[PDB]
Design a protein around this ligand. Structure first.
Ligand SMILES: [Zn+2]
Lengths: 32, 286, 282, 159
């Protein structure tokens, strides 16, 4: 688990960030 | 003088369709049709246009044909269907106008007081404003030209109308556009502007090196006129011009400063507004 | 022989020729011919549009044959596919005589298409375009379309009420329409609102510019005057009674952002262009 | 004709692909279903670059819609699970203005990234999900996620 903890948090980083950019996209499009 | 014209978006498409019509030849078939406009003012309005059969060989560009019969009948139909409309000039799809192009205007100056040409560009590689038009004059020169005759650049623009803006702009939904984009259209403006500057400079230097050496006419046409362009060239960094900037730039900086000042406080209101509602609804929720 | 999920291919000139004609003849039904090509049993394609004189009964077809002739010799020959007219401010529905020309036309060509247009209900964002297709009454019980695909059934829109009150399925069937765009017209249509470098390099003026800022700051002072009293005021009245007593003449917190935005966008570009004009020039 | 390639889908029958080509080059709508599907179906995983060039080279000049659709699926199926060379075609199809060929490329990135949990393609695929104008390539855009999420299937219902 502990090594898979450290891998799974990594996987929880970028897949979480793509949503961060994603809401930017959605908001800017919604303005239009 | 006419000094400018207002061309509607219908034309510039009613030409593209006809360039598409005889566009199967591919190699070269210059599209020529009739331009229709309004005797509006000194400024002139352009609304309608239509085509007419036209061909021309490769060598000795003096062999070209405009069906006067077709012109008479089809314009008779367009007058029967619209007396409000009327002939104003003509066009051709040439990317660069040809030496033959003066004989056409000189021919049909009998229909219009001056059948103004219209150059369109199906492939405006330049991202600037295409489809510019000229009107010929005589500029007999000290050289001894019996009739120094050449066209004249006249500024033009794109027409607009309530309905056509409706239908077109409903068609613009196929692509995204930021026309209300605050402080973005400006940045795009200076970008495309400087692009045009660089393009013009590269062109004029292409011509200038060619004429400078080897093979090009060295006429007194521009050679000193463009020198006078050098004549202006304001020497920006000098004594009092500094007082030109620092006595106003900080002025506008003051206004911007105040604007940021109130903007910060206005943004600060919502912090209290939502920090009240969050915890006050929480403590009452529990 | 059976219907399908048909598609109406258009020509970009066709739309403008529609709206300008109908708008010019706005107070009455304006009529015209729809000219195109029968691409297949499935879809249709219109490429050319033109109208005639009318004082709705069209006058002499001598205009017809000569028109199509001179359209053939210049450009090329084509095929008449349908027609159009206006329902100004109407329910864009085939009128009683409008259907009465339809047995006339479908008897001539099979896929004769009616085209309804209204330059009235069309806002600059979206146009109210329309077109229909007559259906027999002898097959009122028998099926008329095979419905071998969702596109013309559960994939398009929903019949409107003011035209469904006339046919909606009956005496005709609706049809889908799209827009085919040549890349040639597409590129130039992309760019028709830009200007030359002069516009992007203008410096408007600092006398009317500073005069303008001197203007907006003045009343903005008063907007702050009102804003002080309004914000501190706060009757404990619930967040919606404020929203019912604010209709009236109340407007703090709204103009305040506006004047700040405008004063920003002015001063910013006004400084920037002056910057570039000196960095770049000399 | 439509099931012809689905039957011979793993065998990669060049012989049936041959007559399927000339079936595809009839310039018609009735033969578009005849060749457009089985052509790539009998070349599933084949990566026949001449096949890609045939399909994309022919789906640029047509006039019908089925001849565009069968090619839209065949081009998306010709590349199978690469994730590393199909990128040029995914960009070539997504940058297009074709309301079907983008959606054709939108299906493509799904098959070139069969279940690919790569958070790279998720950026621009699920970005044209945002800025995309055509509803067709929009729905085809959002409908590539599960086709790219068997590595972590619990994430689809969160995005
Ligand atoms: Zn009617």
């Amino acid at each position: 688990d502990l090594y898979s903890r450290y891998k799974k948090l990594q996987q929880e980083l970028e897949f979480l960030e793509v949503q961060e950019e994603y809401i930017k996209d959605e908001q800017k499009n919604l303005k239009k | 003088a006419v000094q400018k014209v207002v061309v509607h978006p219908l034309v510039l498409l009613s030409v593209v369709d006809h360039f598409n019509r005889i566009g199967k030849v591919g190699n070269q078939k210059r599209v020529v049709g009739v331009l229709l406009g309004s005797w509006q003012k000194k400024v002139l309005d352009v609304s309608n246009s239509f085509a007419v059969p036209f061909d021309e060989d490769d060598k000795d560009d003096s062999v070209w044909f405009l069906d006067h019969d077709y012109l008479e009948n089809m314009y008779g139909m367009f007058k029967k269907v619209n007396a409000r409309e009327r002939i104003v000039g003509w066009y051709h799809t040439g990317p660069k106008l040809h030496k033959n192009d003066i004989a056409i205007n000189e021919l049909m100056k009998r229909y219009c007081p001056n059948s103004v040409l219209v150059i369109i560009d199906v492939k405006p590689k330049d991202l600037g404003l295409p489809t510019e038009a000229y009107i010929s004059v005589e500029e007999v020169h000290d050289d001894g030209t019996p009739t120094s005759k050449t066209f004249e650049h006249v500024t033009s623009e794109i027409g607009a109308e309530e309905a056509e803006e409706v239908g077109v702009e409903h068609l613009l939904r196929d692509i995204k556009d930021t026309t209300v984009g605050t402080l973005s259209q400006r940045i795009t403006n200076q970008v495309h502007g400087l692009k045009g500057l660089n393009s013009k400079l590269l062109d004029i230097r292409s011509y200038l090196e060619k004429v400078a050496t080897g093979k090009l006419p060295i006429n007194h046409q521009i050679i000193y006129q463009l020198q006078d362009v050098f004549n202006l060239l304001p020497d920006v960094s000098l004594q009092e011009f500094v007082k030109a900037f620092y006595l106003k730039t900080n002025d506008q900086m003051v206004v911007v400063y105040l604007a940021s000042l109130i903007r910060s406080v206005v943004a600060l209101h919502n912090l209290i507004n939502n920090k009240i509602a969050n915890r006050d609804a929480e403590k009452k929720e529990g | 022989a059976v219907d399908t999920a048909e598609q109406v291919y258009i020509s970009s000139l066709a739309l403008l020729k529609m709206l300008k004609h109908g708008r010019a003849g706005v107070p009455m039904e304006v009529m015209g011919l729809m000219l195109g090509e029968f691409v297949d049993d499935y879809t249709v394609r219109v490429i050319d549009v033109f109208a005639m004189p009318q004082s709705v009964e069209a006058v002499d077809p001598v205009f017809q044959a000569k028109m199509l002739d001179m359209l053939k010799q210049t450009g090329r020959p084509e095929m008449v596919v349908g027609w159009y007219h206006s329902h100004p401010g109407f329910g864009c529905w085939l009128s009683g005589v409008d259907i009465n020309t339809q047995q006339s036309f479908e008897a001539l060509s099979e896929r004769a298409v009616a085209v309804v247009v209204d330059p009235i209900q069309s806002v600059k964002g979206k146009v109210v375009i329309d077109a229909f297709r007559l259906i027999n009454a002898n097959m009122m019980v028998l099926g008329h379309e095979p419905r071998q695909t969702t596109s013309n059934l559960g994939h398009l829109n929903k019949p409107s009420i003011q035209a469904l009150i006339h046919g909606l399925n009956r005496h005709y069937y609706s049809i889908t329409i799209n827009y085919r765009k040549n890349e040639l017209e597409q590129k130039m249509l992309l760019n028709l609102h830009k200007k030359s470098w002069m516009e992007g390099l203008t410096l408007q003026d600092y006398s009317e510019h500073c005069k303008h800022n001197e203007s907006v700051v003045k009343e903005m002072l008063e907007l702050a005057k009102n804003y002080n009293k309004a914000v501190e005021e706060e009757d404990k009245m619930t967040p919606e009674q404020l929203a019912i007593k604010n209709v009236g003449k109340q407007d703090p917190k709204r103009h305040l952002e506006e004047h700040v935005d405008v004063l920003m966008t002015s001063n910013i570009v006004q400084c920037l262009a002056a910057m570039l004009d000196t960095v770049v020039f000399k | 004709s439509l099931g012809l390639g689905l039957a011979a889908m793993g065998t990669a029958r060049q012989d049936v692909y041959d007559l399927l080509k000339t079936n595809l080059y009839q310039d018609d709508a009735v033969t578009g279903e005849a060749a457009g599907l089985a052509l790539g179906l009998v070349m599933l995983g084949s990566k026949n670059a001449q096949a890609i060039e045939d399909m994309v080279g022919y789906a640029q000049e047509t006039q019908h819609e089925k001849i565009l659709r069968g090619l839209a699926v065949g081009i998306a199926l010709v590349m199978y699970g690469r994730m590393e060379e199909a990128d040029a075609l995914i960009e070539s199809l997504c940058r297009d203005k074709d309301p079907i060929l983008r959606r054709s490329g939108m299906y493509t990135v799904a098959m070139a990234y069969c279940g690919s949990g790569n958070n790279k393609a998720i950026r621009r695929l699920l970005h044209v999900a945002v800025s995309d104008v055509n509803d067709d390539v929009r729905r085809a855009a959002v409908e590539s996620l599960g086709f790219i999420l068997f590595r972590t299937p619990e994430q689809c219902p969160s995005v």
